[PDB]
mmCIF file of C-alpha atoms and ligand atoms in Angstrom:
data_model
loop_
_atom_site.group_PDB
_atom_site.id
_atom_site.type_symbol
_atom_site.label_atom_id
_atom_site.label_comp_id
_atom_site.label_asym_id
_atom_site.label_seq_id
_atom_site.Cartn_x
_atom_site.Cartn_y
_atom_site.Cartn_z
ATOM 1 C CA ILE A 17 107.517 147.397 -85.389
ATOM 2 C CA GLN A 18 105.575 145.005 -87.600
ATOM 3 C CA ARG A 19 103.170 142.326 -86.338
ATOM 4 C CA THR A 20 101.549 139.318 -88.130
ATOM 5 C CA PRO A 21 97.700 139.075 -88.211
ATOM 6 C CA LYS A 22 95.886 136.536 -86.107
ATOM 7 C CA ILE A 23 92.990 135.091 -88.092
ATOM 8 C CA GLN A 24 89.612 133.717 -87.071
ATOM 9 C CA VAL A 25 87.005 132.479 -89.522
ATOM 10 C CA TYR A 26 83.520 131.939 -88.117
ATOM 11 C CA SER A 27 79.801 132.717 -88.549
ATOM 12 C CA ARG A 28 77.690 135.436 -86.906
ATOM 13 C CA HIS A 29 75.092 132.987 -85.854
ATOM 14 C CA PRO A 30 75.414 129.135 -85.140
ATOM 15 C CA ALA A 31 75.324 127.543 -88.661
ATOM 16 C CA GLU A 32 72.185 125.854 -90.013
ATOM 17 C CA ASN A 33 72.222 124.308 -93.422
ATOM 18 C CA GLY A 34 69.783 126.174 -95.601
ATOM 19 C CA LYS A 35 69.482 129.071 -93.147
ATOM 20 C CA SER A 36 70.888 132.633 -94.101
ATOM 21 C CA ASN A 37 73.802 133.797 -92.062
ATOM 22 C CA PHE A 38 77.024 135.813 -92.084
ATOM 23 C CA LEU A 39 80.523 134.588 -92.802
ATOM 24 C CA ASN A 40 83.207 136.402 -90.677
ATOM 25 C CA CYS A 41 86.942 136.779 -90.879
ATOM 26 C CA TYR A 42 88.247 138.671 -87.952
ATOM 27 C CA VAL A 43 91.952 139.813 -88.433
ATOM 28 C CA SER A 44 93.631 141.358 -85.535
ATOM 29 C CA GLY A 45 97.007 142.120 -83.797
ATOM 30 C CA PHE A 46 98.662 143.457 -86.980
ATOM 31 C CA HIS A 47 100.819 146.291 -87.953
ATOM 32 C CA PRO A 48 101.091 148.294 -90.189
ATOM 33 C CA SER A 49 97.442 148.710 -91.232
ATOM 34 C CA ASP A 50 97.608 147.734 -94.949
ATOM 35 C CA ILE A 51 96.115 144.163 -95.217
ATOM 36 C CA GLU A 52 94.266 142.153 -97.871
ATOM 37 C CA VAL A 53 91.379 139.836 -96.763
ATOM 38 C CA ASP A 54 89.368 137.649 -99.186
ATOM 39 C CA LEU A 55 86.524 135.262 -98.223
ATOM 40 C CA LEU A 56 86.569 132.188 -100.392
ATOM 41 C CA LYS A 57 83.692 129.818 -101.486
ATOM 42 C CA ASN A 58 85.126 126.445 -102.391
ATOM 43 C CA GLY A 59 88.375 128.237 -103.465
ATOM 44 C CA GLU A 60 86.802 131.160 -105.249
ATOM 45 C CA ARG A 61 86.904 134.846 -104.234
ATOM 46 C CA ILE A 62 83.525 136.161 -102.948
ATOM 47 C CA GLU A 63 82.927 139.460 -104.761
ATOM 48 C CA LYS A 64 80.907 141.659 -102.359
ATOM 49 C CA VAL A 65 82.564 141.414 -98.840
ATOM 50 C CA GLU A 66 82.387 144.283 -96.509
ATOM 51 C CA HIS A 67 84.535 145.262 -93.467
ATOM 52 C CA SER A 68 84.394 147.278 -90.341
ATOM 53 C CA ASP A 69 86.134 150.607 -89.922
ATOM 54 C CA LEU A 70 89.931 150.497 -89.103
ATOM 55 C CA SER A 71 90.682 150.658 -85.345
ATOM 56 C CA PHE A 72 93.436 149.446 -83.097
ATOM 57 C CA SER A 73 93.923 147.814 -79.623
ATOM 58 C CA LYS A 74 95.791 149.024 -76.551
ATOM 59 C CA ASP A 75 99.089 147.687 -77.954
ATOM 60 C CA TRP A 76 98.528 149.680 -81.116
ATOM 61 C CA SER A 77 97.907 146.708 -83.261
ATOM 62 C CA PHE A 78 95.003 146.846 -85.818
ATOM 63 C CA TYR A 79 91.793 144.800 -86.152
ATOM 64 C CA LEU A 80 89.097 144.571 -88.781
ATOM 65 C CA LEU A 81 86.176 142.342 -89.371
ATOM 66 C CA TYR A 82 85.385 141.225 -92.835
ATOM 67 C CA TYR A 83 82.022 139.780 -93.483
ATOM 68 C CA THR A 84 79.480 138.649 -96.104
ATOM 69 C CA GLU A 85 75.971 137.042 -96.255
ATOM 70 C CA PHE A 86 75.927 133.357 -96.834
ATOM 71 C CA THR A 87 73.724 130.309 -96.505
ATOM 72 C CA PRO A 88 75.848 127.458 -95.340
ATOM 73 C CA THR A 89 75.287 124.003 -96.876
ATOM 74 C CA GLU A 90 76.570 120.516 -96.238
ATOM 75 C CA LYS A 91 78.560 120.609 -99.426
ATOM 76 C CA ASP A 92 79.911 124.204 -99.473
ATOM 77 C CA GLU A 93 83.335 124.963 -97.878
ATOM 78 C CA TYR A 94 84.566 128.345 -97.016
ATOM 79 C CA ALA A 95 87.892 130.056 -96.058
ATOM 80 C CA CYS A 96 89.519 133.307 -95.264
ATOM 81 C CA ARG A 97 92.757 134.205 -97.198
ATOM 82 C CA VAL A 98 94.867 137.040 -95.747
ATOM 83 C CA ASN A 99 97.962 138.756 -97.119
ATOM 84 C CA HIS A 100 100.043 141.172 -95.086
ATOM 85 C CA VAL A 101 103.624 142.510 -95.400
ATOM 86 C CA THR A 102 104.616 140.141 -92.620
ATOM 87 C CA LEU A 103 103.492 137.184 -94.637
ATOM 88 C CA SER A 104 105.613 135.665 -97.461
ATOM 89 C CA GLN A 105 102.502 133.846 -98.888
ATOM 90 C CA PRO A 106 98.810 134.571 -98.301
ATOM 91 C CA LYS A 107 97.601 132.473 -95.268
ATOM 92 C CA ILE A 108 94.361 130.495 -95.822
ATOM 93 C CA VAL A 109 92.208 129.541 -92.773
ATOM 94 C CA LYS A 110 89.239 127.233 -93.456
ATOM 95 C CA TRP A 111 85.841 127.697 -91.731
ATOM 96 C CA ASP A 112 85.062 125.073 -89.104
ATOM 97 C CA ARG A 113 81.463 125.568 -88.026
ATOM 98 C CA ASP A 114 82.473 124.369 -84.559
ATOM 99 C CA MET A 115 85.186 126.998 -84.069
ATOM 100 C CA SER B 4 81.614 152.273 -65.382
ATOM 101 C CA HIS B 5 81.433 153.995 -68.805
ATOM 102 C CA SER B 6 83.961 155.365 -71.375
ATOM 103 C CA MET B 7 84.114 157.379 -74.650
ATOM 104 C CA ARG B 8 87.145 157.032 -76.929
ATOM 105 C CA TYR B 9 88.392 158.338 -80.343
ATOM 106 C CA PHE B 10 90.842 156.483 -82.413
ATOM 107 C CA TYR B 11 92.734 158.390 -85.010
ATOM 108 C CA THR B 12 94.967 156.737 -87.477
ATOM 109 C CA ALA B 13 97.107 158.765 -89.955
ATOM 110 C CA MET B 14 99.060 156.726 -92.610
ATOM 111 C CA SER B 15 101.567 158.051 -95.086
ATOM 112 C CA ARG B 16 101.833 156.234 -98.403
ATOM 113 C CA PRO B 17 104.259 157.823 -101.039
ATOM 114 C CA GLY B 18 102.859 157.141 -104.570
ATOM 115 C CA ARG B 19 99.405 156.597 -103.300
ATOM 116 C CA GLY B 20 98.409 160.298 -102.760
ATOM 117 C CA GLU B 21 98.120 162.241 -99.439
ATOM 118 C CA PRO B 22 98.320 160.355 -96.166
ATOM 119 C CA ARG B 23 95.081 158.651 -95.212
ATOM 120 C CA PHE B 24 93.191 159.671 -92.035
ATOM 121 C CA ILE B 25 90.760 157.528 -90.254
ATOM 122 C CA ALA B 26 88.827 158.277 -87.101
ATOM 123 C CA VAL B 27 86.456 156.127 -85.114
ATOM 124 C CA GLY B 28 84.485 156.828 -82.036
ATOM 125 C CA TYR B 29 83.353 154.450 -79.383
ATOM 126 C CA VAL B 30 81.063 154.528 -76.370
ATOM 127 C CA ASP B 31 82.095 151.558 -74.167
ATOM 128 C CA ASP B 32 82.308 148.656 -76.697
ATOM 129 C CA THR B 33 79.926 150.353 -79.228
ATOM 130 C CA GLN B 34 81.247 152.335 -82.241
ATOM 131 C CA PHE B 35 79.062 155.232 -83.106
ATOM 132 C CA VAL B 36 80.949 157.348 -85.591
ATOM 133 C CA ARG B 37 83.512 157.005 -88.399
ATOM 134 C CA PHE B 38 85.574 159.206 -90.710
ATOM 135 C CA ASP B 39 87.718 158.223 -93.651
ATOM 136 C CA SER B 40 89.617 160.655 -95.784
ATOM 137 C CA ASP B 41 89.507 158.228 -98.719
ATOM 138 C CA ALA B 42 85.768 158.151 -98.985
ATOM 139 C CA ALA B 43 84.196 159.584 -102.177
ATOM 140 C CA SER B 44 82.746 162.363 -100.041
ATOM 141 C CA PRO B 45 84.654 162.305 -96.652
ATOM 142 C CA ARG B 46 82.320 163.032 -93.782
ATOM 143 C CA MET B 47 81.819 162.063 -90.206
ATOM 144 C CA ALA B 48 79.153 159.274 -90.407
ATOM 145 C CA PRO B 49 76.825 157.393 -87.997
ATOM 146 C CA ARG B 50 77.630 153.808 -87.165
ATOM 147 C CA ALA B 51 75.229 153.445 -84.256
ATOM 148 C CA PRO B 52 71.389 153.912 -84.160
ATOM 149 C CA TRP B 53 71.131 156.342 -81.203
ATOM 150 C CA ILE B 54 73.643 158.848 -82.820
ATOM 151 C CA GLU B 55 71.746 159.522 -85.989
ATOM 152 C CA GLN B 56 69.397 161.783 -84.065
ATOM 153 C CA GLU B 57 72.103 164.489 -83.927
ATOM 154 C CA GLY B 58 71.384 167.475 -86.210
ATOM 155 C CA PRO B 59 73.309 168.907 -89.192
ATOM 156 C CA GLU B 60 75.374 171.128 -86.938
ATOM 157 C CA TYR B 61 76.767 167.875 -85.435
ATOM 158 C CA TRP B 62 77.643 166.113 -88.637
ATOM 159 C CA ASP B 63 78.803 169.182 -90.526
ATOM 160 C CA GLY B 64 80.985 170.338 -87.656
ATOM 161 C CA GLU B 65 82.448 166.986 -86.989
ATOM 162 C CA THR B 66 83.211 166.653 -90.757
ATOM 163 C CA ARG B 67 84.965 170.067 -90.907
ATOM 164 C CA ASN B 68 86.815 169.104 -87.635
ATOM 165 C CA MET B 69 88.059 165.748 -89.056
ATOM 166 C CA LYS B 70 89.210 167.444 -92.228
ATOM 167 C CA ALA B 71 91.072 169.882 -90.174
ATOM 168 C CA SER B 72 92.385 167.151 -87.911
ATOM 169 C CA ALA B 73 93.519 165.094 -90.933
ATOM 170 C CA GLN B 74 95.609 167.974 -92.276
ATOM 171 C CA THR B 75 97.237 168.624 -88.949
ATOM 172 C CA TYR B 76 98.113 164.956 -88.662
ATOM 173 C CA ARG B 77 99.646 165.155 -92.043
ATOM 174 C CA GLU B 78 101.664 168.104 -90.910
ATOM 175 C CA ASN B 79 102.662 165.975 -87.840
ATOM 176 C CA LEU B 80 103.864 163.027 -89.972
ATOM 177 C CA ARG B 81 106.111 165.381 -91.840
ATOM 178 C CA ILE B 82 107.519 166.888 -88.442
ATOM 179 C CA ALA B 83 108.140 163.325 -87.262
ATOM 180 C CA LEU B 84 110.119 162.666 -90.503
ATOM 181 C CA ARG B 85 112.429 165.457 -89.407
ATOM 182 C CA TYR B 86 112.638 164.343 -85.798
ATOM 183 C CA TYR B 87 113.675 160.766 -86.797
ATOM 184 C CA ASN B 88 115.707 161.881 -89.843
ATOM 185 C CA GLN B 89 113.538 159.593 -92.022
ATOM 186 C CA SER B 90 112.947 159.593 -95.745
ATOM 187 C CA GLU B 91 109.873 161.113 -97.409
ATOM 188 C CA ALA B 92 109.571 157.974 -99.511
ATOM 189 C CA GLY B 93 108.961 155.788 -96.443
ATOM 190 C CA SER B 94 105.496 154.950 -95.116
ATOM 191 C CA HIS B 95 104.659 155.809 -91.594
ATOM 192 C CA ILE B 96 101.734 155.749 -89.182
ATOM 193 C CA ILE B 97 100.525 158.096 -86.270
ATOM 194 C CA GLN B 98 97.991 156.537 -83.939
ATOM 195 C CA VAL B 99 96.197 158.521 -81.370
ATOM 196 C CA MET B 100 93.595 157.483 -78.799
ATOM 197 C CA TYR B 101 91.835 159.887 -76.424
ATOM 198 C CA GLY B 102 88.838 160.056 -74.250
ATOM 199 C CA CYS B 103 87.294 159.763 -70.750
ATOM 200 C CA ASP B 104 86.148 157.225 -68.331
ATOM 201 C CA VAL B 105 83.255 158.142 -65.966
ATOM 202 C CA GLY B 106 81.996 156.294 -62.951
ATOM 203 C CA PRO B 107 78.359 155.165 -62.141
ATOM 204 C CA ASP B 108 77.799 158.682 -60.726
ATOM 205 C CA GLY B 109 78.485 160.079 -64.173
ATOM 206 C CA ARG B 110 81.706 161.994 -63.166
ATOM 207 C CA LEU B 111 85.120 161.930 -64.538
ATOM 208 C CA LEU B 112 87.464 159.093 -63.311
ATOM 209 C CA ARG B 113 90.251 159.299 -65.719
ATOM 210 C CA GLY B 114 91.211 161.054 -68.957
ATOM 211 C CA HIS B 115 93.304 159.812 -71.824
ATOM 212 C CA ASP B 116 95.476 161.159 -74.638
ATOM 213 C CA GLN B 117 98.175 158.728 -75.796
ATOM 214 C CA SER B 118 99.859 157.950 -79.135
ATOM 215 C CA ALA B 119 102.209 155.787 -81.048
ATOM 216 C CA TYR B 120 104.495 156.274 -84.012
ATOM 217 C CA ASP B 121 104.979 153.242 -86.217
ATOM 218 C CA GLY B 122 103.328 151.013 -83.646
ATOM 219 C CA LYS B 123 105.417 152.084 -80.659
ATOM 220 C CA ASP B 124 104.613 154.490 -77.800
ATOM 221 C CA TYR B 125 105.326 158.175 -78.578
ATOM 222 C CA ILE B 126 103.849 160.480 -76.042
ATOM 223 C CA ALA B 127 101.097 160.110 -73.402
ATOM 224 C CA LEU B 128 99.072 162.388 -71.055
ATOM 225 C CA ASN B 129 99.585 161.163 -67.478
ATOM 226 C CA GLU B 130 96.837 160.534 -65.019
ATOM 227 C CA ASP B 131 97.336 163.873 -63.497
ATOM 228 C CA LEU B 132 96.300 165.452 -66.830
ATOM 229 C CA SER B 133 99.207 167.791 -66.379
ATOM 230 C CA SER B 134 102.397 166.014 -67.220
ATOM 231 C CA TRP B 135 103.579 163.737 -70.068
ATOM 232 C CA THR B 136 105.317 160.502 -70.695
ATOM 233 C CA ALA B 137 107.640 160.779 -73.741
ATOM 234 C CA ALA B 138 108.641 157.313 -74.873
ATOM 235 C CA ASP B 139 111.768 158.363 -76.801
ATOM 236 C CA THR B 140 114.055 161.266 -77.634
ATOM 237 C CA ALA B 141 111.923 162.410 -80.671
ATOM 238 C CA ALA B 142 108.886 162.414 -78.361
ATOM 239 C CA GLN B 143 110.852 164.426 -75.768
ATOM 240 C CA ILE B 144 111.066 167.246 -78.367
ATOM 241 C CA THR B 145 107.234 167.154 -78.584
ATOM 242 C CA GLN B 146 106.899 167.012 -74.740
ATOM 243 C CA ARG B 147 109.226 170.148 -74.572
ATOM 244 C CA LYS B 148 106.979 172.050 -76.921
ATOM 245 C CA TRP B 149 103.617 170.946 -75.402
ATOM 246 C CA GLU B 150 104.763 172.052 -71.976
ATOM 247 C CA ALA B 151 105.344 175.565 -73.291
ATOM 248 C CA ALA B 152 102.007 175.626 -75.154
ATOM 249 C CA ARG B 153 100.059 174.627 -72.056
ATOM 250 C CA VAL B 154 98.621 171.692 -74.086
ATOM 251 C CA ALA B 155 97.819 169.454 -71.092
ATOM 252 C CA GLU B 156 95.509 172.047 -69.516
ATOM 253 C CA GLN B 157 93.611 172.235 -72.863
ATOM 254 C CA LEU B 158 93.336 168.595 -73.081
ATOM 255 C CA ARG B 159 92.041 168.668 -69.560
ATOM 256 C CA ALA B 160 89.401 171.272 -70.375
ATOM 257 C CA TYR B 161 88.041 168.953 -73.019
ATOM 258 C CA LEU B 162 88.195 165.783 -70.933
ATOM 259 C CA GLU B 163 86.405 167.379 -67.967
ATOM 260 C CA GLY B 164 84.170 169.428 -70.154
ATOM 261 C CA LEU B 165 82.743 168.353 -73.524
ATOM 262 C CA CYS B 166 84.031 164.752 -73.168
ATOM 263 C CA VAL B 167 82.086 163.731 -70.050
ATOM 264 C CA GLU B 168 79.169 165.839 -71.071
ATOM 265 C CA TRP B 169 78.696 164.316 -74.416
ATOM 266 C CA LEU B 170 79.362 160.838 -73.039
ATOM 267 C CA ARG B 171 76.626 161.444 -70.452
ATOM 268 C CA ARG B 172 74.337 162.448 -73.344
ATOM 269 C CA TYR B 173 75.205 159.409 -75.513
ATOM 270 C CA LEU B 174 74.557 157.107 -72.497
ATOM 271 C CA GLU B 175 71.101 158.586 -72.089
ATOM 272 C CA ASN B 176 70.083 158.648 -75.833
ATOM 273 C CA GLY B 177 71.050 155.086 -76.173
ATOM 274 C CA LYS B 178 70.126 153.918 -72.713
ATOM 275 C CA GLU B 179 68.283 150.909 -74.137
ATOM 276 C CA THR B 180 71.286 149.393 -75.795
ATOM 277 C CA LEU B 181 74.245 150.951 -74.096
ATOM 278 C CA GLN B 182 72.968 150.265 -70.471
ATOM 279 C CA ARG B 183 71.287 146.938 -71.074
ATOM 280 C CA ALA B 184 72.333 143.557 -69.707
ATOM 281 C CA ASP B 185 73.091 141.292 -72.601
ATOM 282 C CA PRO B 186 74.425 137.992 -71.117
ATOM 283 C CA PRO B 187 76.006 135.356 -73.340
ATOM 284 C CA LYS B 188 73.944 132.595 -74.753
ATOM 285 C CA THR B 189 75.897 129.733 -73.514
ATOM 286 C CA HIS B 190 76.366 126.017 -74.496
ATOM 287 C CA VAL B 191 78.983 123.165 -74.259
ATOM 288 C CA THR B 192 79.889 121.009 -77.211
ATOM 289 C CA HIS B 193 81.836 117.783 -77.523
ATOM 290 C CA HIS B 194 83.984 116.094 -80.196
ATOM 291 C CA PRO B 195 86.197 113.063 -79.551
ATOM 292 C CA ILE B 196 89.657 113.638 -81.109
ATOM 293 C CA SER B 197 90.561 109.977 -80.363
ATOM 294 C CA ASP B 198 89.908 106.883 -78.336
ATOM 295 C CA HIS B 199 92.036 108.235 -75.542
ATOM 296 C CA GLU B 200 90.655 111.817 -75.373
ATOM 297 C CA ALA B 201 87.867 114.229 -76.369
ATOM 298 C CA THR B 202 87.433 117.913 -76.789
ATOM 299 C CA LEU B 203 85.235 119.965 -74.538
ATOM 300 C CA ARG B 204 84.397 123.451 -75.669
ATOM 301 C CA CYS B 205 82.328 126.075 -73.808
ATOM 302 C CA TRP B 206 80.670 128.690 -76.014
ATOM 303 C CA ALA B 207 79.457 132.211 -75.026
ATOM 304 C CA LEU B 208 77.551 134.043 -77.815
ATOM 305 C CA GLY B 209 75.652 137.278 -78.299
ATOM 306 C CA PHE B 210 77.044 139.082 -75.314
ATOM 307 C CA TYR B 211 77.773 142.762 -74.596
ATOM 308 C CA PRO B 212 80.054 144.183 -73.474
ATOM 309 C CA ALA B 213 83.048 142.143 -74.688
ATOM 310 C CA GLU B 214 84.502 141.631 -71.167
ATOM 311 C CA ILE B 215 83.993 137.989 -70.201
ATOM 312 C CA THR B 216 85.745 135.100 -68.247
ATOM 313 C CA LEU B 217 85.615 131.457 -69.555
ATOM 314 C CA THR B 218 87.327 128.961 -67.380
ATOM 315 C CA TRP B 219 87.234 125.209 -67.177
ATOM 316 C CA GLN B 220 87.555 123.447 -63.816
ATOM 317 C CA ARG B 221 88.229 119.868 -62.863
ATOM 318 C CA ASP B 222 86.746 118.877 -59.615
ATOM 319 C CA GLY B 223 86.420 122.600 -58.889
ATOM 320 C CA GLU B 224 89.945 123.769 -59.817
ATOM 321 C CA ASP B 225 90.838 125.703 -63.036
ATOM 322 C CA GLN B 226 92.719 123.846 -65.745
ATOM 323 C CA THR B 227 94.550 127.140 -66.657
ATOM 324 C CA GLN B 228 97.440 125.682 -68.507
ATOM 325 C CA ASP B 229 95.502 123.004 -70.233
ATOM 326 C CA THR B 230 92.542 125.225 -71.430
ATOM 327 C CA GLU B 231 92.828 126.755 -74.980
ATOM 328 C CA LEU B 232 91.340 130.281 -75.045
ATOM 329 C CA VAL B 233 90.307 132.146 -78.259
ATOM 330 C CA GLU B 234 90.405 135.848 -78.511
ATOM 331 C CA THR B 235 87.085 137.642 -77.878
ATOM 332 C CA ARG B 236 85.683 138.391 -81.375
ATOM 333 C CA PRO B 237 82.946 140.553 -82.774
ATOM 334 C CA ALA B 238 79.790 138.862 -84.068
ATOM 335 C CA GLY B 239 79.172 141.577 -86.643
ATOM 336 C CA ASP B 240 76.045 142.769 -84.934
ATOM 337 C CA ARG B 241 77.557 144.642 -81.973
ATOM 338 C CA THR B 242 77.771 141.538 -79.856
ATOM 339 C CA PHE B 243 80.806 139.401 -79.111
ATOM 340 C CA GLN B 244 81.671 135.669 -79.070
ATOM 341 C CA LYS B 245 84.223 133.559 -77.190
ATOM 342 C CA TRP B 246 84.979 129.934 -76.476
ATOM 343 C CA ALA B 247 87.252 127.975 -73.958
ATOM 344 C CA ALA B 248 88.323 124.525 -74.853
ATOM 345 C CA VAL B 249 89.996 121.727 -72.934
ATOM 346 C CA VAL B 250 90.807 118.209 -73.955
ATOM 347 C CA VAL B 251 89.864 115.601 -71.431
ATOM 348 C CA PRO B 252 90.132 111.692 -70.917
ATOM 349 C CA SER B 253 86.879 110.292 -72.427
ATOM 350 C CA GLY B 254 84.679 109.185 -69.455
ATOM 351 C CA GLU B 255 85.860 111.816 -67.112
ATOM 352 C CA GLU B 256 83.996 114.699 -68.805
ATOM 353 C CA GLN B 257 81.651 115.135 -65.786
ATOM 354 C CA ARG B 258 84.692 116.154 -63.638
ATOM 355 C CA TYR B 259 84.778 119.282 -65.846
ATOM 356 C CA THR B 260 82.560 122.319 -65.560
ATOM 357 C CA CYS B 261 82.607 125.559 -67.543
ATOM 358 C CA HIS B 262 82.320 128.760 -65.549
ATOM 359 C CA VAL B 263 81.084 131.853 -67.147
ATOM 360 C CA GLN B 264 81.145 135.372 -65.733
ATOM 361 C CA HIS B 265 79.448 138.280 -67.373
ATOM 362 C CA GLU B 266 77.784 141.583 -66.181
ATOM 363 C CA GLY B 267 74.602 140.799 -68.076
ATOM 364 C CA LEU B 268 74.138 137.725 -65.926
ATOM 365 C CA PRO B 269 72.514 137.656 -62.488
ATOM 366 C CA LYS B 270 75.216 135.326 -61.061
ATOM 367 C CA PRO B 271 78.119 133.298 -62.563
ATOM 368 C CA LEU B 272 77.008 130.252 -64.734
ATOM 369 C CA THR B 273 78.276 126.724 -64.119
ATOM 370 C CA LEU B 274 77.993 124.575 -67.124
ATOM 371 C CA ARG B 275 78.360 120.751 -67.979
ATOM 372 C CA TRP B 276 78.179 118.904 -71.211
ATOM 373 C CA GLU B 277 74.861 117.089 -71.855
ATOM 374 C CA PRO B 278 73.837 114.667 -74.579
ATOM 375 C CA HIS C 16 81.848 164.568 -79.746
ATOM 376 C CA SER C 17 85.443 164.964 -80.886
ATOM 377 C CA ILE C 18 87.821 167.648 -79.549
ATOM 378 C CA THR C 19 88.667 170.727 -81.603
ATOM 379 C CA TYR C 20 92.460 171.162 -81.326
ATOM 380 C CA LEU C 21 94.814 171.543 -84.157
ATOM 381 C CA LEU C 22 97.920 170.439 -82.355
ATOM 382 C CA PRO C 23 101.472 170.312 -83.854
ATOM 383 C CA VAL C 24 103.950 167.867 -82.424
HETATM 384 N N1 LIG D 314 99.409 161.681 -77.275
HETATM 385 C C1 LIG D 314 99.241 162.526 -78.488
HETATM 386 N N2 LIG D 314 100.014 162.423 -79.622
HETATM 387 C C2 LIG D 314 99.734 163.141 -80.742
HETATM 388 N N3 LIG D 314 100.726 162.930 -81.819
HETATM 389 C C3 LIG D 314 101.930 162.223 -81.615
HETATM 390 C C4 LIG D 314 102.051 160.859 -82.326
HETATM 391 C C5 LIG D 314 102.735 162.053 -82.881
HETATM 392 C C6 LIG D 314 98.640 163.992 -80.784
HETATM 393 N N4 LIG D 314 98.127 164.800 -81.816
HETATM 394 C C7 LIG D 314 97.021 165.523 -81.338
HETATM 395 N N5 LIG D 314 96.815 165.034 -79.983
HETATM 396 C C8 LIG D 314 95.795 165.429 -79.155
HETATM 397 C C9 LIG D 314 95.038 166.653 -79.481
HETATM 398 C C10 LIG D 314 93.617 166.434 -79.491
HETATM 399 C C11 LIG D 314 93.513 164.867 -79.606
HETATM 400 C C12 LIG D 314 93.198 164.406 -81.065
HETATM 401 O O1 LIG D 314 94.144 164.899 -82.014
HETATM 402 C C13 LIG D 314 94.711 164.338 -78.973
HETATM 403 C C14 LIG D 314 97.873 164.124 -79.769
HETATM 404 N N6 LIG D 314 98.027 163.315 -78.592
HETATM 405 CL CL1 LIG D 315 112.362 174.496 -74.217
#
């Protein structure tokens, strides 16, 4: 069975402009385990992004946390772009600092 | 009130080398070890502070054991290919989770050893730690073989033995984090979506463990069908986040209270929006 | 600590 990833883009701490923080993209509920996750800054791929170790839920679906250091600003806009076998085109979810 | 779990993932990938094997270890909601066969130098590695104190015989032995387990899981991927009459050019996955839950007294409550092939149930050790649940015909072949080999008794020897004993040790070494009350740092936000309505959102941040309840009430009764719940998510620092949202008629906000339950809290919080 | 059990299916 194949399942499509749910996506949540958010920050480790409540965002303050000018204050260092972490940008997170939590992908979950997907199968198989192969997946591609990019964090974007104003449309551009952020080079050094890390992720947690591969693990799965009770229903056997996988989850990973992709993260990177960032200092949020008023101007700067961020997103998470995920591609999986269950997706025809890479899905892009924008960061909302209130979600 | 505590648990230790190991999650093994073996994935075949024809054209991309040997099948990949990943193991992660958790105590409650805290990951403490990892293994990845793809790493430049594959070893069992620490992912929690309180585990790093274990000596070379722990990290060397766990590394040798993971390398051995990886080879066996590769063997098992091949066997499954034969059970299911599948092609060697196909890509498949074995997932196995095993471990023990112990009570507040520190004694075994339940042992686990269950698995999936390609995302679906395969075979599982039952609560009696003596019988199996095979999910399909291919897994009935395995069940047949494991009964002869007295596999359940040996799983049971681990689950009553090393599993509970090491879990008890881990809980003691990391008592300051693993047994600490970390209640959520809560607040309620407000953003009017229109003239008619507005969005109430109840946040719960920085909590451990992940288990939490966020419910909205109107005049004291849950708006279960109206409330939008997001999945509990990792903060990246071993803590978790969650928010419940409900859309309410502007002016009637005060009818709505956000109720928060967590084990790090003295007693359940009741929140309201404030300006 | 993980179990040591090289188990065939
Ligand atoms: N339920 C289950 N399914 C397995 N394989 C099936 C999916 C093909 C499996 N292989 C080994 N074990 C136990 C032996 C020690 C632990 C770690 O390996 C678990 C297993 N338990
Ligand atoms: Cl037989």
